[PDB]
Design a protein around this ligand. Sequence first.
Ligand SMILES: COc1cc(CN)cc(OC)c1OC
Ligand SMILES: COc1cc(CN)cc(OC)c1OC
Ligand SMILES: [Ca+2]
Ligand SMILES: [Ca+2]
Lengths: 204, 204
Amino acid sequence: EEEDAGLVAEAEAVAAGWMLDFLCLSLCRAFRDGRSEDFRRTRNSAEAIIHGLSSLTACQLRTIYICQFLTRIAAGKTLDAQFENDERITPLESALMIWGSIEKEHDKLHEEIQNLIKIQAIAVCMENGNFKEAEEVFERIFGMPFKSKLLMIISQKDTFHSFFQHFSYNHMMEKIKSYVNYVLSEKSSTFLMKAAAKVVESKR
Amino acid sequence: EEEDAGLVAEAEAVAAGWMLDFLCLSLCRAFRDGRSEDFRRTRNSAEAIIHGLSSLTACQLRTIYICQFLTRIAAGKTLDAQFENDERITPLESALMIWGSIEKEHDKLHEEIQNLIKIQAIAVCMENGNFKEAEEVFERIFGMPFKSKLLMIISQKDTFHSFFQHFSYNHMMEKIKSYVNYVLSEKSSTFLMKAAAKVVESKR
Ligand SMILES: COc1cc(CN)cc(OC)c1OC
Ligand SMILES: COc1cc(CN)cc(OC)c1OC
Ligand SMILES: [Ca+2]
Ligand SMILES: [Ca+2]
C-alpha cells in the first residue's frame, strides 16, 4: 500500500513532465502562428501543470522559462500586467530577465533578440505617453551608441521615432519567431506529441 | 502546409483527451485519499485542459461529469460556491444534477449515493443556520417517508438532528469513495497513466 502510493506519485511526476513538454510545444506553435486565443488557453493549461510540479530538472526549468518568456513577449504592450513581485518591472523587462537566465547558446540571434527587447521595452512606454516610465525602464536596463540615442529619443518625448521603425516591435516578434521555430523542431520529438502524431497518421 | 496544420491540430486533440483521462484519474485518487491540496491543483489542471477541448466524445463527457461531480462534492459545505448560472443552486444540488445526468448504471450504490446527497443538501444548510435555504433546497429536490421526515426536521429548526447522523456527510463521502474506487480501477489502464507506470517500473 505504501509502495503503491510511492509508485503512483512517481508515475504522476513522469506524466506531468510529458504534459509540460507537450504544452510548451503547443504554446510555441500558437505564438508562431499568431493564434491568440489558443495561446491564452494553452498558457492557462501550462501554468496549471507547472503549479502541480515540485522540483525541476534542468530541462524542465528551461521549458518553463521558454513558456514564461513567450507569455511576457505576448503581453509586451500590456503595461498593466505585473509579472514580478516588484510592481515597477514591465513585461518586456521581465522577458529580458528570463532571456538572460535560460541555459542556451548566446549566438548572434540571441543578442539580436536581447537588443530588440531592450529597445522595445522603452518604445512601448513612449508609444503610451509614459515618458517618465520610459526613462525609468532605460535606467534599469542600460546600466554607448544605442544607449545615448535612446536617451535622446526619451528626452525628446516623441510618442513615435525613426529608430523604433528599424528596431520595431514586428522586427522583435519575427526574430523571436525564428527562435520559436528552433524550439518547435527540438520539442516535436517529445513523447506525448510523437505518440499523438503516430495515432493521427495511423488513422489516414 | 495546410495538411500539416490539420494533422497537428488533430494530434493536439488526441493528446488533450489523454491528458483529460490522466487528470481525472489523479483527481479521483486525490479525492479518495483526502489529499485536499493535490485535489485543488489537479482540479485547476483539469479545468484548464477541458477549456482547451471543443466537441466531446460520450466517454469524454462522462469523464468531465465525474470531475465536475467530485469538485461539487468536495465543495459541498462551501455554501458560498456558485456552480450554476442560477445563483440559488447549492453545490450538493449541482452534484445531484450531474449524478442524474451521467451515462452510468443505476445500481443500488447509485441510488444510495443519490439519496445521501439529497439528505446532505438539506443537512448542510441546517448546520449553517440557513433554515429558509434548507426549505428552498427541499422544495427544489423533493418534488413520502424520507420526504416527510425531512420537512419535519427543517420545520423544527434544529442545527443538528438524529436522522442526519445515520445519513451523515461522512456516510455520503464513504459511499462516493466506493464509486471512485471503481472509476480508478476503470481508468488506471488509460494511455498516459499506463505509459508513465511502465517508465517508473522499468527504473526499479
Ligand atoms: C523551483 O522553482 C520553480 C518550481 C516550480 C514548480 N511549481 C515553478 C517555478 O516557476 C513557475 C519555479 O521557479 C522557476
Ligand atoms: C459541449 O459541452 C461542453 C464542452 C466543453 C469543452 N470546453 C466543456 C463543457 O463543460 C465544462 C461542456 O459541457 C458539458
Ligand atoms: Ca504599469
Ligand atoms: Ca450561498
